[PDB]
Design an enzyme around this catalytic site. Structure first.
Site, PDB file in Angstrom:
ATOM      1  N   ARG A 240      38.956  11.418  46.870  1.00  0.00           N
ATOM      2  CA  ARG A 240      39.602  10.096  46.805  1.00  0.00           C
ATOM      3  C   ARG A 240      40.882  10.126  46.658  1.00  0.00           C
ATOM      4  O   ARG A 240      41.755   9.324  47.464  1.00  0.00           O
ATOM      5  CB  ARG A 240      38.831   9.075  46.064  1.00  0.00           C
TER       6      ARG A 240
ATOM      7  N   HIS B 287      33.023  -1.888  39.552  1.00  0.00           N
ATOM      8  CA  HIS B 287      32.447  -1.378  40.839  1.00  0.00           C
ATOM      9  C   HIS B 287      33.339  -0.398  41.643  1.00  0.00           C
ATOM     10  O   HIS B 287      34.585  -0.376  41.294  1.00  0.00           O
ATOM     11  CB  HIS B 287      32.223  -2.634  41.859  1.00  0.00           C
TER      12      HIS B 287
ATOM     13  N   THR C 257      28.537   2.805  46.808  1.00  0.00           N
ATOM     14  CA  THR C 257      28.727   3.427  45.435  1.00  0.00           C
ATOM     15  C   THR C 257      28.491   4.930  45.494  1.00  0.00           C
ATOM     16  O   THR C 257      29.253   5.764  45.044  1.00  0.00           O
ATOM     17  CB  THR C 257      27.962   2.650  44.583  1.00  0.00           C
TER      18      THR C 257
ATOM     19  N   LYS D 129      13.501 -10.204  61.557  1.00  0.00           N
ATOM     20  CA  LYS D 129      12.672  -9.844  62.770  1.00  0.00           C
ATOM     21  C   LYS D 129      11.988 -11.163  63.513  1.00  0.00           C
ATOM     22  O   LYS D 129      10.870 -11.456  63.208  1.00  0.00           O
ATOM     23  CB  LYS D 129      11.602  -9.067  62.134  1.00  0.00           C
TER      24      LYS D 129
ATOM     25  N   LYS E  12      28.113  -9.218  49.309  1.00  0.00           N
ATOM     26  CA  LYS E  12      27.043  -9.343  50.163  1.00  0.00           C
ATOM     27  C   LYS E  12      26.065 -10.592  49.920  1.00  0.00           C
ATOM     28  O   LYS E  12      25.539 -10.737  48.729  1.00  0.00           O
ATOM     29  CB  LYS E  12      26.461  -8.028  49.864  1.00  0.00           C
TER      30      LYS E  12
HETATM   31  N1  LIG Z   1      33.843  -2.887  55.467  1.00  0.00           N
HETATM   32  C1  LIG Z   1      32.701  -3.032  55.318  1.00  0.00           C
HETATM   33  N2  LIG Z   1      31.844  -3.838  56.470  1.00  0.00           N
HETATM   34  C2  LIG Z   1      30.566  -4.298  56.132  1.00  0.00           C
HETATM   35  N3  LIG Z   1      29.823  -3.814  55.080  1.00  0.00           N
HETATM   36  C3  LIG Z   1      30.008  -3.177  54.146  1.00  0.00           C
HETATM   37  C4  LIG Z   1      31.564  -2.704  54.255  1.00  0.00           C
HETATM   38  N4  LIG Z   1      31.867  -2.069  53.000  1.00  0.00           N
HETATM   39  C5  LIG Z   1      30.794  -2.292  52.151  1.00  0.00           C
HETATM   40  N5  LIG Z   1      30.038  -2.673  52.911  1.00  0.00           N
HETATM   41  C6  LIG Z   1      28.448  -2.954  52.654  1.00  0.00           C
HETATM   42  O1  LIG Z   1      28.262  -2.612  51.001  1.00  0.00           O
HETATM   43  C7  LIG Z   1      27.149  -1.594  51.180  1.00  0.00           C
HETATM   44  C8  LIG Z   1      27.550  -0.797  49.729  1.00  0.00           C
HETATM   45  O2  LIG Z   1      27.487  -1.623  48.724  1.00  0.00           O
HETATM   46  S1  LIG Z   1      27.944  -1.086  47.248  1.00  0.00           S
HETATM   47  O3  LIG Z   1      27.153   0.108  47.077  1.00  0.00           O
HETATM   48  O4  LIG Z   1      28.212  -2.128  46.178  1.00  0.00           O
HETATM   49  N6  LIG Z   1      29.538  -0.324  47.558  1.00  0.00           N
HETATM   50  C9  LIG Z   1      30.643  -0.864  48.030  1.00  0.00           C
HETATM   51  O5  LIG Z   1      30.505  -2.000  48.627  1.00  0.00           O
HETATM   52  C10 LIG Z   1      31.812   0.037  48.162  1.00  0.00           C
HETATM   53  C11 LIG Z   1      31.834   0.812  47.431  1.00  0.00           C
HETATM   54  S2  LIG Z   1      33.676   1.722  47.558  1.00  0.00           S
HETATM   55  C12 LIG Z   1      33.647   0.468  48.828  1.00  0.00           C
HETATM   56  C13 LIG Z   1      35.065   0.224  49.217  1.00  0.00           C
HETATM   57  N7  LIG Z   1      36.242   1.013  49.003  1.00  0.00           N
HETATM   58  C14 LIG Z   1      37.193   0.660  49.724  1.00  0.00           C
HETATM   59  C15 LIG Z   1      38.692   1.443  49.672  1.00  0.00           C
HETATM   60  C16 LIG Z   1      39.406   0.717  50.601  1.00  0.00           C
HETATM   61  C17 LIG Z   1      39.272  -0.357  51.445  1.00  0.00           C
HETATM   62  O6  LIG Z   1      40.433  -0.796  52.227  1.00  0.00           O
HETATM   63  C18 LIG Z   1      38.191  -0.992  51.513  1.00  0.00           C
HETATM   64  C19 LIG Z   1      37.015  -0.344  50.861  1.00  0.00           C
HETATM   65  S3  LIG Z   1      35.346  -0.821  50.565  1.00  0.00           S
HETATM   66  N8  LIG Z   1      32.935  -0.277  48.774  1.00  0.00           N
HETATM   67  C20 LIG Z   1      27.380  -1.013  52.191  1.00  0.00           C
HETATM   68  O7  LIG Z   1      26.097  -0.198  52.270  1.00  0.00           O
HETATM   69  C21 LIG Z   1      27.472  -1.939  53.396  1.00  0.00           C
HETATM   70  O8  LIG Z   1      26.186  -2.723  53.506  1.00  0.00           O
HETATM   71 CL   LIG Z   2      27.276  -7.711  46.431  1.00  0.00          CL
END
Ligand SMILES: Nc1ncnc2c1ncn2[C@@H]1O[C@H](COS(=O)(=O)NC(=O)c2csc(-c3nc4ccc(O)cc4s3)n2)[C@@H](O)[C@H]1O
Ligand SMILES: [Cl-]
Ligand SMILES: [Cl-]
Length: 539
Positions: free
Chosen positions: A214, A241, A339, A439, A525
């Site tokens: 990272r 988070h 995550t 669905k 979400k």
């Molecule tokens: N950009 C996106 N568009 C649409 N959906 C998105 C998304 N990011 C996460 N998600 C959704 O969150 C889920 C994951 O949920 S989670 O486990 O809680 N973890 C996350 O949402 C998660 C973990 S790290 C992280 C990011 N780090 C970053 C660093 C820089 C930056 O500019 C943007 C981001 S987003 N997001 C995914 O499977 C997806 O469904």
């Molecule tokens: Cl969420």
């Protein structure tokens, strides 16, 4: 297989040393420079890099003197506060795994989470204290609770400064403290919890190798933000988070002033951008709604803001484009991750834009899109499940081999659970979660596509869409809507508006309910179960 998309080489190779060693190296540089590390946007309180580094070293020593060994465990339970990263960094410095949680967890969530990570010490905010004390009644192995965000002992518990003082010799010199080297690929650094899970939280084990990867991304000239000590960044995402954790740790490697904003009224939001000369921010979608509607932008000097990003949840393409236009920016940057992938593994590359795209595969990663039934890889412009592979994949869930096996397949690919596609130029588009698809007959309708249409309506503040059970069609799309203040729409008005904008299949046959708040998790979400429950209730 030409269907696999391979990310490029990073500009900055992964450095030698643990994540603690790397953080210490950069923090020391910025400390000597005299830079500010954290600022509370609402109070204006600052911690310099020097102060943050000193306290993190002193806490590291204190935890060793207390008796914690390599691969021990501590936790946090705190809403965002400027002190949040002191125990995180201390743990990374000494090889003691850190389990972050938020005060906003329910007790059922917190008792489960801490029961999995088994921290010896919990660093609790004042606000979180009652919950931590309650959790300790079940998780009886929690020995000590330390108050994170108090300068004095509080309700009979030692504050952070007291714990440090009581566990270090008088005149202890931080400059003398050594970071502890670890087996980088194996040593757990953090135990994290995703947001928006349908079940109880699992403990995601992330290693030092995950984190130092990272660190390469975070400062990458194409996939991150370049080192520029003193530059201010606004942050609004939860620190416990992965989204807040790894953006913030990356910003410390970058030397930035992390301007932590916890209040989202438009005046405070805009005043913060102006007063701290913030150059970038990563928003969640609801914050875009505020910016698109604001009649106050013109009252503030927002000229320092050159970048707006988004992550965590689907962003309406049209809303993002409107907000970028208001700020005279080319577009909204985006990151997508889980995550279980540490941080974002698809990020919009600087200089390589595409309307509506989530971005491109990050350095050292690979991605593919698989057919939902056959699991075979797909070419461009074909929707399927996004899968990823690379050195930010988690070690595994804590004490849950079955869940680990379900997520990361026999070939080492992590199955994200998300539907998406990539185009001819390898821009990825993340549509929604597989589990969320509605669905309706033979269709698989993504709620995010309907949510986008709803959010674009000037009288609709927020919306969430889910499927209403139906004997003939299986599921009917339905919506929960929060109206803008002073505006009204009937169910029929909303349904007719949507029908004017979407295919026949996407009509809101499941109806519309009006609420004060759309049920969502901590990073935006939609809570499908909760929406379905609301839609089930008669008007
Ligand atoms: N950009 C996106 N568009 C649409 N959906 C998105 C998304 N990011 C996460 N998600 C959704 O969150 C889920 C994951 O949920 S989670 O486990 O809680 N973890 C996350 O949402 C998660 C973990 S790290 C992280 C990011 N780090 C970053 C660093 C820089 C930056 O500019 C943007 C981001 S987003 N997001 C995914 O499977 C997806 O469904
Ligand atoms: Cl969420
Ligand atoms: Cl949540």
């Amino acid at each position: 297989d030409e269907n696999i998309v391979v990310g490029p080489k990073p500009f900055y190779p992964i450095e030698e040393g643990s994540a603690g060693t790397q953080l210490r190296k950069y923090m020391e540089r910025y400390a000597k420079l005299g830079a500010i590390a954290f600022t509370n946007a609402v109070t204006g309180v600052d911690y310099s890099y020097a102060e943050y580094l000193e306290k993190s070293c002193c806490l590291g020593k204190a935890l060793q003197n207390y008796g914690l060994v390599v691969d021990g465990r501590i936790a946090l339970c705190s809403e965002n506060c400027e002190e949040f990263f002191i125990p995180v960094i201390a743990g990374l410095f000494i090889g003691v795994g850190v389990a972050p949680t938020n005060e906003i967890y329910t007790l059922r969530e917190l008792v489960h989470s801490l029961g999995i990570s088994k921290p010896t010490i919990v660093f609790s905010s004042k606000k979180g204290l009652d919950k931590v004390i309650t959790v300790q009644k079940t998780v009886t192995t929690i020995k000590t609770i330390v108050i994170l965000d108090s300068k004095v002992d509080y309700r009979g518990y030692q504050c952070l400064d007291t714990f440090i003082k009581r566990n270090t010799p008088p005149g202890f010199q931080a400059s003398s403290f050594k970071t502890v080297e670890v087996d980088r690929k194996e040593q757990v650094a953090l135990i994290m919890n995703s947001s928006g899970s349908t079940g109880l939280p699992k403990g995601v084990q992330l290693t030092h190798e995950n984190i130092v990867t990272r660190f390469s991304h975070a400062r990458d000239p194409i996939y991150g933000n370049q080192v520029s000590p003193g530059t201010a960044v606004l942050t609004v995402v939860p620190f416990h988070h992965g989204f807040g954790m790894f953006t913030t740790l990356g910003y410390l490697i970058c030397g930035f002033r992390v301007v932590m904003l916890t209040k989202f009224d438009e005046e405070t939001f805009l005043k913060t951008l102006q007063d701290y000369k913030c150059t970038s921010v990563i928003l969640v979608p609801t914050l875009f709604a505020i910016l698109n509607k604001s009649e106050l932008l013109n009252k503030y000097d927002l000229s320092n803001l050159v970048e707006i990003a988004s992550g965590g949840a689907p962003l309406s393409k049209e809303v993002g484009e409107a907000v970028a236009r208001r700020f005279n920016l080319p577009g909204v940057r985006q990151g997508y991750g889980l995550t279980e992938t540490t941080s974002a593994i698809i990020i919009t590359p600087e200089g390589d834009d595409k309307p509506g795209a989530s971005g491109k595969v990050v350095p050292l990663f690979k991605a593919k899109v698989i057919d939902l039934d056959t699991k075979k890889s797909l070419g461009p412009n074909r929707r399927g499940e996004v899968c990823v592979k690379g050195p930010m994949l988690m070690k595994g869930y804590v004490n849950n081999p079955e869940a680990t096996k379900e997520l990361i397949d026999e070939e080492g690919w992590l199955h994200t659970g998300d539907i998406g596609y990539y185009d001819e130029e390898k821009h990825f588009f993340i549509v929604d979660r597989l589990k969320s698809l509605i669905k309706y007959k033979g269709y698989q309708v993504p709620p995010a596509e309907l949510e986008s249409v709803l959010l674009q309506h000037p009288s609709i503040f927020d919306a969430g869409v889910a499927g209403v059970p139906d004997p003939v069609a299986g599921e009917l799309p339905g919506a929960v809507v929060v109206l803008e203040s002073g505006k009204n729409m009937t169910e029929k008005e909303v349904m007719d508006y949507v029908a004017s904008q979407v295919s026949n299949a996407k009509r809101l046959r499941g109806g519309v309910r009006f609420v004060d708040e759309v049920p969502k998790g901590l990073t935006g979400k939609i809570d499908g179960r909760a929406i379905r429950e609301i839609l089930k209730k008669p008007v």
